[PDB]
Write a protein that binds this ligand. Structure first.
Ligand SMILES: C[As](C)(=O)[O-]
Length: 119
């Protein structure tokens, strides 16, 4: 009865920007941390960011600091990832994940992924 649904993926030119959304259902995101994890085809998982929506506290992987911004709209029970200055190395499936209040083994719920392709 819990779902995470990502959207916003697609094709982006190098240097471009993209905003992903993660709509949560079956729980209140204020009761959790929501995270974004990416994995390219043929490569391993990389956690990029987490947010605690009730407090606004955010955490970023060093590799995306400044370039990526994680946010939430608790009125829509939705988290977002703003990605700027995209490079080929950012090509990946981006998964939203959540856990009841940097590690991917601390998430209870996982989305379906949304594919981001940088030319
Ligand atoms: C969560 As961190 C990479 O800013 O110590």
């Amino acid at each position: 009865e819990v779902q995470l649904e990502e959207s916003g993926g697609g094709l982006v030119q190098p240097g471009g920007s993209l905003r992903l959304s993660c709509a949560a259902s079956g729980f209140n995101i204020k009761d959790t941390y929501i995270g974004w994890v990416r994995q390219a085809p043929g490569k391993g998982e990389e956690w990029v960011a987490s947010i605690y929506p009730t407090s606004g506290y955010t955490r970023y992987a060093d590799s995306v600091k400044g370039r990526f911004t994680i946010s939430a709209d608790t009125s829509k029970n939705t988290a977002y990832l703003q990605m700027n200055s995209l490079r080929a190395e950012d090509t990946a499936v981006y998964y939203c994940a959540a856990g009841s209040i940097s590690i991917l083994e601390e998430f209870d719920y996982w989305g379906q992924g949304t594919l981001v392709t940088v030319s």
